[PDB]
From a paper:
Two cognate immunity proteins, Tsi1 and Tsi3, are produced by the bacterium to inactivate the two antibacterial effectors, thereby protecting its siblings from self-intoxication. Among the delivered proteins, Tse1 and Tse3 are biochemically characterized as lytic antibacterial enzymes that degrade the peptidoglycan of recipient bacterial cells, thereby causing rapid cell lysis of competing bacteria in the environment. It is now known that Tse1 functions as a peptidoglycan amidase with specificity towards γ-d-glutamyl-meso-2,6-diamino­pimelic acid (d-Glu-mDAP), while Tse3 functions as a mur­amidase that hydrolyzes the β-1,4-linkage between MurNAc and GlcNAc.
The crystal structure of the Tse3–Tsi3 complex was solved by SAD phasing using selenomethionine-substituted protein and was refined at 1.9 Å resolution. The two protein molecules form a compact complex with overall dimensions of 60 × 58 × 93 Å, and the molar ratio of Tse3 and Tsi3 agrees well with the 1:1 stoichiometry observed in solution. The results reveal that Tse3 contains a C-terminal catalytic domain that adopts a soluble lytic transglycosylase (SLT) fold in which three calcium-binding sites were surprisingly observed close to the catalytic Glu residue. The refined structure at 1.9 Å resolution also unexpectedly shows three calcium-binding sites in Tse3, one resembling the EF-hand motif and the other two being non-EF-hand sites close to the catalytic Glu residue. The involvement of these two key catalytic residues in Ca2+ binding is astonishing and impressive, as calcium-binding sites so close to the active centre have never been observed in previously characterized lysozymes and lytic transglycosylases. Three loops of Tsi3 insert deeply into the groove of Tse3 and completely occlude its active site, which forms the structural basis of Tse3 inactivation. As a result, the adjacent Ca2+-binding sites (Ca1 and Ca2) harboured locally in this region are significantly stabilized, and Glu126 is directly involved in Ca2+ coordination as a ligating residue for Ca2.
Residue numbers in the entry:
A (entry chain A): 2 to 12, 20 to 408
B (entry chain B): 22 to 145
The structure:
Amino acid sequence: TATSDLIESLIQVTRQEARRVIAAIRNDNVPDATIAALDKSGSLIKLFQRVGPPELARSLIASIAGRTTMQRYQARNALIRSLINNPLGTQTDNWIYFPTITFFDICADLADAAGRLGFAAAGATGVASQAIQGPFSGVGATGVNPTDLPSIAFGDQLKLLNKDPATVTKYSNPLGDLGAYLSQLSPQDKLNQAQTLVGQPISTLFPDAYPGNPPSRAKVMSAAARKYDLTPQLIGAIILAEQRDQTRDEDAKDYQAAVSIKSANTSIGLGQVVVSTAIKYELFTDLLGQPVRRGLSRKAVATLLASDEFNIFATARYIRYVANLASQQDLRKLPKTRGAFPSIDLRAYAGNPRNWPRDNVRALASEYTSRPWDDNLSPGWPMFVDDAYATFLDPGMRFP
Amino acid sequence: VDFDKTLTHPNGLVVERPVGFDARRSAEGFRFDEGGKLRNPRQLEVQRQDAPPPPDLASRRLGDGEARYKVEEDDGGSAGSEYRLWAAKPAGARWIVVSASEQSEDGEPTFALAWALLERARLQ
Ligand SMILES: [Ca+2]
Ligand SMILES: [Ca+2]
Ligand SMILES: [Ca+2]
């Protein structure tokens, strides 16, 4: 192929040469044929060996794994062979909890899933908030990945370990009175937050797994909605509520505590999914195949929860789980639930949110922030999520 | 400060209300729910109990006496696991029991307010 020829002609290369080769692989119309040619000539292994440092290797590997099908396993083998004298591979920086071949496999599965589920294509571009303090300063607002945040100061790590109240408070949910938080925002302020949240590109740990630029969060949310018979308005409401009750500091703690020596069971990312819960309910089922999933370390799971597409899918899958569970309950056994949400319709939960009473959205909100269907309810989360939902119902809000 | 209004049960239990909590009377004591409409309100109850605690619970120093207790944890939601403390201290030939709950995504809560409440309580 033209691409394999170009690559062989350029065969550590400079950063310029590497970016050229990667660009060529990504613009290739016949990725499989190109890989076959390179595998035959023996130049593929050379490509993998000569493209470093890890940043560039990640781009190359993600591109190849994502675009190949008939030749993907030969590519994987060539990569493996190239790693014989390079134990480090792509296992650095944000990706230190992914063995290099796991990185390859994640990129492959994700590309396939984005294609299959309908969130591969880009189209939004911006724009993110510049906030770094206060409510709505987490990744939902800012697009700054929790894995990119600077290490928390050592002394703060120690005080957090010892449960020092001031320090714990600094790194925890910023909101007390939820009603008051909402009442200070105009309807336009609220729409602005929702649009900022869903309109910006996903903050992803695997950008080159996509055929082009990463998709908007809205595109991924619509895909998840289709997969789990939800709506992007509902997924959006749950996430916007979480992200209002989120700061940059909390993002830093959420992730760093999860991957520390303590392996903390924090709620992480857009939908604030708990690590052990992602594991227990296999919340990445529809993006990653069983072999990858069975291989993932706990810290790899936490890290994935910091990647927006994995998090959105996990969030949606969990929402559908909570709804299905509700649809199996006996309302007579949930008198407090009936008291708080007297128009709740448990059977309706089995179907699409377009047909749920609003009391169903309120109840599910309680049972997303807390243990689900135990008849113990959050007094404030239902109204908080319901306000977000109302915002997403605004005709100014459009999803793919 | 932690406490304001002095509350007195007909059964002789006397304790001060935690500041910012709504208080109601229960069968053998008082129930406190954190005020407002919060995401994850603390919930506490303090009661006279005449029967001794179950045997072989963990113990801790409380004031000049001891207390026996157990904390349980379960999956909750995005605000973290659900945690509940049950603790008892002697009061003469009887006991005072505090139970308390809150969610935490950062491991077991200190339950500092519940322990302060248990220490503050007395039987008349
Ligand atoms: Ca939060
Ligand atoms: Ca969190
Ligand atoms: Ca609940």
